[PDB]
Amino acid sequence: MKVAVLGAAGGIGQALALLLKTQLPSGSELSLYDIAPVTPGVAVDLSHIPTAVKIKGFSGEDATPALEGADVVLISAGLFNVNAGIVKNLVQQVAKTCPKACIGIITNPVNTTVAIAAEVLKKAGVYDKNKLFGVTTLDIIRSNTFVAELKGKQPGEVEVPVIGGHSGVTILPLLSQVPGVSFTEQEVADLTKRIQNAGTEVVEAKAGGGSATLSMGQAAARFGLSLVRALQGEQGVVECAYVEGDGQYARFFSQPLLLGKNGVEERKSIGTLSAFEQNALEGMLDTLKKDIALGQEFVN
Ligand SMILES: [Ag+]
Ligand SMILES: [Ag+]
Ligand SMILES: [Ag+]
Ligand SMILES: [Ag+]
Ligand SMILES: [Ag+]
Ligand SMILES: [Ag+]
Ligand SMILES: [Ag+]
C-alpha cells in the first residue's frame, strides 16, 4: 500500500511525512512530491529511519513519477486563488495517473478545495464520491484536547464527533454525544467558540510565523493511517471526513464514515443533535453552501 504526499516540503508536509514514515504499517511505501528542489533530500533524510516503509522523493513540475502505483494521495501543497489553482493542478495530475487512489485534500480552505477536486475528477470522468476526502481530523483532535482538559479526562480516551465544514461557523462539534460527559450551556458555547477559532489561536501565537503545521500533520497522519488500515481490510474503521454524501444539508458535508477496501464503505448518520447543535447546523448551512459554490465556480 503506497501513500503519495503532494506538497511534502512544506511545514504540514514534512510533519506528515515524518509521522507516516514512522507509523505506516510494515511493507508500506511513501512517495514525497513538491516543487521545492529539497524534496528528494527530504525522503533520503527520512529513509535513514529504521522502519519497513520504502520512501522516495521527487521534485519538478511533474508529480506523475511520485503518483505511480499510489493507493492513497494526500494533497497538502500551498492567496486563495494561488492555493486553489495548486489544488486543481495536482488533482488533474492525479486523474491522469491513478484514477483509483483515495484522495485526501488537506490544503485549505477545505470546504472549497474539495469541491474543486470533485469538479476536476468529474471533468476527467474518473470521479468516485467514495474516494475523495476533505481532511477535517484537526477539528476532532482539537475537540478531544479541549474537552479532556475542561473535563479532566485522559486526552487519548476522549472522542468528539465533529460534523459540517472545516472553517469558522461550519465546524460543529457534537458535544452532546461525548459518552459519560455532560456540559453546561455555557461550556458548550465556550468550547464551540474555541474549536471554531482554534486556527486563529495558532496564527496569533505564531506572531505571523504561520498557521498550524505540526498538529495538522498529526491529524492528517491519523486520517491517512485509518485509510491505509481500511484499505488493507481492517474492520470497523470509522473516521469523520468532508465528503460528497446524500446532500441532506449540503453537497459536501463532514460526517462519520465507515471506511473500507474502496474508500468509503458506509456514510453513518450524524445521530441525535441537541437544540444548540441543530440550531448551529442550520445557521451555518448558507455559509457552507457558498463555500462549496466558490469551488464549483473556480473550476466551471
Ligand atoms: Ag496506482
Ligand atoms: Ag496509477
Ligand atoms: Ag484507494
Ligand atoms: Ag479509493
Ligand atoms: Ag486543516
Ligand atoms: Ag466527527
Ligand atoms: Ag468521527
UniProtKB/Swiss-Prot annotation:
Changing Q278K: In strain: EC35, EC38, EC40, EC44, EC46, EC47 and RT272. Changing D286N: In strain: E830587. Changing D71N: In strain: EC47, EC49, EC50 and RT272. Substrate binds at N108, R142. Keywords: NAD, Oxidoreductase, Tricarboxylic acid cycle. GO terms for cellular component: cytoplasm; cytosol; extrinsic component of membrane; membrane. Changing R142C: Loss of interaction with substrate. It comes from the Bacteria. NAD(+) binds at G7, A8, A9, G10, G11, I12, G13, D34, N83, I106, T107, N108, M216. GO terms for molecular function: L-malate dehydrogenase (NAD+) activity; malate dehydrogenase activity; oxidoreductase activity; protein homodimerization activity. It catalyses: (S)-malate + NAD(+) = oxaloacetate + NADH + H(+). The active site is at H166. Gene3D superfamilies: Lactate dehydrogenase/glycoside hydrolase, family 4, C-terminal (3.90.110.10), NAD(P)-binding Rossmann-like Domain (3.40.50.720). GO terms for biological process: anaerobic respiration; fermentation; glycolytic process; malate metabolic process; tricarboxylic acid cycle. Its EC number is 1.1.1.37. Homodimer. Belongs to the LDH/MDH superfamily. MDH type 1 family. Catalyzes the reversible oxidation of malate to oxaloacetate. NCBIfam families: MDH_euk_gproteo. PANTHER family: MALATE AND LACTATE DEHYDROGENASE (PTHR11540), MALATE DEHYDROGENASE, MITOCHONDRIAL (PTHR11540:SF16). This is Malate dehydrogenase. It comes from Escherichia coli (strain K12). The gene is mdh.
